């Protein structure tokens, strides 16, 4: 034998070696960083239009990257991770220097207690009780360089290159993210084939410049050089692009993930609507929406944000956000009705993408995937049959709580997320640095106003044609027109003119870190993979059945209760975990802060992080069991 | 430089070595295992009265360990961890073999679909809809042998020896756990010095055979060989016992933990009563009891179990539980009132120890410590000033989300718990194997009925004197008398006679694993230590103040809302985290499944697990910061 | 220099490291294991219909997996490899326990000398001279966990996921394996384009419900969701499926392998028909069928099993086999004719798939590939020109016998096979666990009798449609009708009704180990790869030529002698080795125990095992030569 | 536990050492 000290050290060294001896891939970007250029005096420099520049100095007149030297310093700081190198990077509004090639001078500083004059938008000017908005910096840029004790390393795993401005793929994606902004107040029952059950309209009537029927046509018709993303055959596409590729847009498969079981049933996953039966003697049912949080409850009702109230719809509002104006918590929320119980309608069931965007806005990491984990445990969901002490207590003479029970999975959903964020943080900051969809909506507008210098915005030219030739932009300007009649931005100079800016559900828009690699989807992919591994992924949810059809749940007209939907086949653990993975992941896309590529490839990156942890932790147990974890790309694996 | 693969492997090897090079202590029990004996034909064998035997065959007539060979096989199985060795261990009721020294024969098996006849209690006989209760086995016995990737090893950390039946310490502890059973329906406002604010009685009037005033006297007067635990000076006590030692019992310090800040304010920690202010525009306040779970809410109202309804109050009910009768979920809960909102009183505020016992009954691991973590984040609580990117965004030009924000602490509270359970699982199963307080209540009764053989129960003799000489038992028999008038156990033969059994708030009583080392307290200690480390432990909670006194919260008469309590000094993050640590940890003691020693030493074991993880994870970051984590034993440490 | 001891140790350490430093792939199944479910009381459990359950307890009334707990114990035993864990797994017929979730009780045991009453089929009831059939257990389940001194490790190599019940691929495969059962007595001259030479009918006239012309149409027309396997373009298929994919079924390419040279010439490889010229002075020719086994001969005539006599054609016969009834050697064989020499027709030339099924039934591992090796050596076949001492003896002054002659290759064909079996044993038992084609024929029948519970056999529904819509099943029931008129199973209750069971050429059917990964094909692929490596793969076989056409051999009407076939081009060593690889590998498929996927992917797995050994053994020799081993997937490699 | 790769390599190294640690005789004509 060996002393336990040695055995414990050996296993931690074996896990460390196992992690190292796996395939360490090479990180390949789409080369957009230094490809698209613009003009300087007696030469040319890169435009960095296709790069994330949110927080840096943007020209206050043109809304383009003010100084390229700022981005070169921003990039430098990312790779070093030195706190000192962050401090040299200019932030928010700035003045271009008198000597060319030098770093920009930051207008706002520590002695600026009153910051009203620096911003050009009314909202930002009187944001902090009349003082004016504050600067906000980038979030955990050096997290990609942070190591970990378990799972694969952040740079020991990679995502494929982001699609380009010239590509047919991106054109379909920006159109999809654009469409969702105009379809942001649609009732969820509309996002599915009408044969399943009766659909309804959102009780709150909003001005709509786009419907579902139109959106499917636009997404199917949108094309570059006579090629549509959904239409294009395999032969044309690259091995990387062949993987992401989706089919022709259907009422059922619209705005949905490509993970198995996403198509089956309604849009919204049960684990975002249903709860558990009341502890002990049942006072309420699963349709109540109270999760069985041990002896206390979880309310499944999200905070209701005032419908059809999108932000950054004009240039000033957009520019100030892109100049790192801290506008968090300036979005308004519907007040409660004294007559009604359970703080309705202040807190209602997630009825529209807006309410998903709101849920996802403050989601707080792994909440959604823990909640789903809690729901299954309370329901009486079985664990993967490979796991020890799973048989009747009399026969096996052991139950298993500490390491093969609820306790182990409760920690695992939470564990994985942290490793997830670090892994994607590298892909965002140190590799791809893809612009936010809000920025592309920026690029689209500025081009249509003939802004920039020379052939700077020529790359975007191809993109805006398809968006206008499908007739989408014409509806976006109409939607924006009505949004700029709001008193908060009515007097903004840009409100009078046309705006092609993609509406943001949040005043601040996207978080202060690059687009490519989604923080929500990476956590979603990782946390869900752990749940699918541990639980019996096939387990058909016993939500009950009526009239020989297995019942499901979607919200009612005002989200006051759940409307039952009756399907031919029952819902499985796998599908609903994959659906809530997709719901939260695409939940950002509805808010207009992510593309589909950000979701899909993050979900694939997420499972690699999660699988790696499970692989490494298997060295510890001497029971010698098997955990069968299903993947999003077809067949399952045996850990 | 080195390639990232090598650096990542080196850090995981360095963490593994750091863990090994720390002090690996030697595990010392109190030698009770094979000390107390009883008689066999022409010799003597150990009684195993002071050991955990719950689940094994107990003699149906005497309620003592039927065969010592069963315990020797039970012990053997623990140390091996072999699934086959578990299967040989007899469970529940059994028949003593015709040849002596041989293993007992199990009555119940896989062909016993109807198990009514095997049980001697009415409740268990008609438990499973008339079929009869099923056998339940021991929970994760082999978890002590499971290794881990981060933190200290389970056998690389130890707890001091459990107190003995002869000791003054245990006598005070069993009296404390006994008292709590009779004080189980007391309103929490009573568990504090009355000078702070107006106290109240529980709206539900229960027959009480013991009051607070009496309980303090009993705990202060109870003594062995003219020595009281709280009275005894340092000189008399051992270095291990000097640490646990508490002061003379006060109205303020009664049934409370010895962690700093437990004495200050009411009994119940705020993080078990208060919530967050409503997201965005405030529709309700913190006194509401809705935690700011991102965009959804957490209900702080526990399920209300029918008051003054304790179980295992007679021999039959006690014996069947001790014979591993699965009675989970047979406890009844108060129905809701249609007229009232928020499912009242079915779901009410934690008003009595019963409601804490109920909360803790299904607590689901780290819920309480995550909830507390969520509350602080929503409040706007500051992190430990050592942590990077903590200064204004403009100055430092970075915020930190992924690794130095909410995300990192959210995973850490959840992370630590799993490592905690494995560490204590060893101390329970492989080392101390201390009997449950319910078992000691068993030993007390059987002695007072002159059960057992020869000088078997002589060890307990000394214990029962002090309990009777304080006049406690006389009140326990009176409490039990009224409890056995219930129709569910009225017709049980033992109901007619006197019962000295400690009432259990759960029908099944303690979980199927030994007493010493508390699973709740180990998680509590570990999770709270992580919170204290990350957050500014000193941060005075801004709950508001009225009349120049800082306001606090305790429940009202029916737990319909929070009653404000006004203190001279404000509550700190440290104290309330230490109080919720103690609340949940002692929450078991109220249910009657743990002693104080199980709490205190687990809280100390818990922080060692947590600190060890933090120490190891510090190798990853290159920022070079400092986390100042305060300890329960005075001064703070710098990680 | 180094001492030889050190050099010898270094090379064995270098080989060990080389093996480890190669790509270790991750084992991915199709997730069918826990996907398809059925109903239990108040819940749902997995059906394990798509898993190998042969030997376990099958319900005697429905013919489905009796208890899922048995499979969970069966799986557990596989992964542990513990002899004790095998013994707990119930075998053959069993009684479902009174408590649910418990292990089944085995009817047959060691005190059952007379086992007539346990079986439901006449054949099995009077199998062991009236005593009744015995139980048979699973074959080398723990061989996947066995290590090796040379070649790649069993878990250091993997096969792609098995096709699913829903898939178009499987539907084409089961139709192919079904067709072969009805075409089992076809003369081999029919399995090729008729332009090559005159075709003939099997002298023994059997009732045929299917012809070649019909079988090609059925295989080309069979489709799922309007998709045929052979018709489907690359774009639709996955990278794994794109590899297996075959072209539209031709008279030449029907039931043939996709290895280069399989299409060229007749179906049956020469090395299964031809022999060598008589040692010294030629008394007979190559058309004789006597292999030059040094100074003795090998008879190429297989034992003739009585034609059109298939087994397990009814439910009882099928069920008893699936309940592990040991029926080995109950198949009857044609008696010899006293008048004729060389024990004819008792021993005849392999004339029909039946005779191949019979050859392959007792093939005894590597016999076929050694025989082929012996034939080439006797013919005067050249070795790969890279090998040392290959030139005229006078010039080079060395011949090479021990290490570069016959001796080295003779051991290599035999060597590789053992490593092959262990490698695939893992893929069968520990990963894929694909049901046998006989089991799917079982699933098809039970569905058509409306057996099982709820939506248990719904997965198979899609499969049986295509089989009936092509009109195949209608012919299978007709074939089965005539087979159940046999007196051995005439009185079996199921004989009266319709049977859709795929006929088995063996009474026992498939061997006691899962379908996916073929033991014959893995050995075939491995052994043939070694032969192709060593010999000059291109070497055009000098069998002679007549009328300016290179002669070949196929059998005559009664397999009394070889009928010559004249082709435009000569046969190469590569093609005929690939053809005998395919012949033996597909030889199982004719018997109805394997699919095409089992052959193709095993042949690819086989070469990886073989190449790995050759790579490792190259460290030993200091001659520094090159062995050019051709692959089945196009180009050759240089070892 | 160890990863199968390591266990498989260790056994092949153990076999190689076992072979070397046996009596290596001197060849006398
Ligand atoms: Na169990
Ligand atoms: Na900050
Ligand atoms: Na030669």
Residue numbers in the entry:
A (entry chain A), B (entry chain A), C (entry chain A): 1 to 639
D (entry chain A): 1 to 29
Quote the authors verbatim.
Vanadium-dependent haloperoxidases (VHPOs) are biotechnologically valuable and operationally versatile biocatalysts. VHPOs are categorized according to the most electronegative halide they can oxidize, leading to chloroperoxidases (VCPOs), bromoperoxidases (VBPOs), and iodoperoxidases (VIPOs). The general mechanism for VHPO-catalyzed reactions is based on the two-electron oxidation of halides.
Mutagenesis experiments in the second shell combined with activity screening assays revealed that R425S-VCPO was transformed into a chloroperoxidase capable of efficient aromatic chlorination, even on a preparative scale. An isosteric phosphate, obtained from the reservoir solution, replaced the cofactor vanadate in the enzyme crystals. In contrast, in R425S, this section consolidated in a loop structure, strongly influenced by the introduced serine residue (highlighted in blue). This structural variation has no immediate influence on its protein subunit but causes mutual interactions of two neighboring monomers in the ‘head-to-tail´ orientation of the dodecameric enzyme structure. Consequently, the loop triggers the formation of a defined tunnel with the vanadate cofactor at the end. Although the key catalytic residues in the first coordination sphere of cofactor binding are still strictly conserved within the R425S-AmVHPO mutant, the Ser425 from the adjacent subunit alters the hydrogen-bonding network within the active site, thus forming a tunnel protecting the vanadate in the active site.
